[PDB]
Amino acid sequence: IFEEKQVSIFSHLDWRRRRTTENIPKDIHPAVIRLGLKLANYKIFGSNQRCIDLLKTFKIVIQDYQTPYGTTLSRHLTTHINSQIAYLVSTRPLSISMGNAIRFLKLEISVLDIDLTDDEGKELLLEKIDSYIRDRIIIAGQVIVQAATEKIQDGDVILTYLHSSTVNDVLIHAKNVGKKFRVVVVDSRPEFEGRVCLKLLTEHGIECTYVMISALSYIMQEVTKIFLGGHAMLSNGALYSRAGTSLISLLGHESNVPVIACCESYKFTERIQLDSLVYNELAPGDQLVNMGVDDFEEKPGVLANWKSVKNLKLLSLKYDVTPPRLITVCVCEMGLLPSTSVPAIINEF
Template structure:
């Protein structure tokens, strides 16, 4: 199917599209979805037919709440009607939609690699400049990805970097040289800001692990997993408490990998966090983003874990790459968040035959809420381990300022 889409996309690039100059309006990722006029206007122009959730939770009416059912079929049927979407971007969008690609780093890398393929196959139309036309193309690809799933904060920072590089391309470069430069810039971003950054984080974080420690982590953060594996390779003796939560139970995957490497582990759900915390000596957490006021934006439940650790006076260390830092200030999880499928929380994983809410989900008196992220206040964070070093939450604005000096985010 993807090969067919690639052939069709290349053909449409040659013969053109009757509405290629029309600017498609899609819901902005931070649009207030309780504004009825803007929602209706966006829904009319959306690629995927979107229906509002039956019973919306009042506090989260401003967030996009759509029941996703037949999006894949609709996307495939409307492929001929869309503004040209590169097949690599199309494939990544579907993987976002169905959760095949999860995690901030994985989603960001997949998006950048898809843009690499799109840039490779790009050709500048006559009477247009590469910088302006390619920026518009990237914008249309982003609109498609946003309809599949809202972008994460780290992905937004990567997009700023790419658009900045496009805008600063020397006019003396040929099209072939410009495309090669952009693809090289994307490789450099992935290698320096994600891969090498994780290695630096591991180098710093492993110094905080001593023999006899009981380390607690929540979910399946990739940076924390690398820290634990490296500490084990160094011969340090410690035990890991993996705390998990429904509906995805991502901690089970982490548990399987750690046990497979011979690490002594304990597995529990987040509801037992207060019972296990008295054994813990340090807490290692991941983050989707770190905001300018020191707030850690991460998987829902992270704030609960950090709060309990703070009450037990257990140090909380957050492992986060600097490219995820953002100048935004956020005090709660209400104004900006992402909502997952509300139906999955009413089902038991592996026991789909059991549904105690069967018949009640259609009731007007029942509202299901499945939040994806939460905001952990800086008061509960002892230290943030990043590729800039180990810093307190109060030093986050300094890192954001240094990134601005590198002209990566502006």
């Protein structure tokens, strides 16, 4: 139990990670272990890609699952997966995409017909997982890409933030179909995921400009359109994405630049956050220590001993909540919709 929430505003955020397989429970599937290691040690691993790998992992878990004598398949498979989840959660907090897919899988297990034999039950679950990835993630993503690349006019200067697989695929596809444009890649500390983006975009021959988020004001005067890949859309219409995304949207608003949020409908949640502190994810403050424009290359930082230093704390939040009034349009597989249509789309399932 962790209950003590003290003066610090960040105190409630869970900071405990598991980077190794030391003292691991014996009931954890090998496929889950590998996923868990990739989760807490990867650096660019899209929210979509996280969900896809999770579902494909659960497929292996279910396939190899043999129901015990102490229960039917319905009641205990949820227990076995609950163990796999708890371990995965310990490595790194679940994404909204992962959390939603989990609620989906748990549901279909409970609505499994008991008259089905265990092999028919497993076969069916794998069918629906296959259909979930196919429809809700892949096809939905394709629709978003085409619908969003539609809004790109010749002469546009598209701003993007960090590394968004959705936005990346939109920009690339735009280049392919013959759209004439250029891109502003905005990057940020503690980790320069925007360089991963810049590499991908330049490899496809897309004309790019690379700046830090501090130079936002300067570079915003060249931007015609802003494209954002989301982690989740809140039910009040707010966009839940990485880092400075709200800052991009805020300064984008002041320069009359349309803020376009691209998010698959399966990443819509019923949660509504008012501030960016209540639901977030802490990143290790040690990332902020070494500063000279690189992640692991080493030369001693001024804040290296910050844990030992009294009253000196470092932290980097992974996400923030961009208010709905700063988002112009939400692009999903349902088409271009006002972001306040999120809870409406949810009921349509």
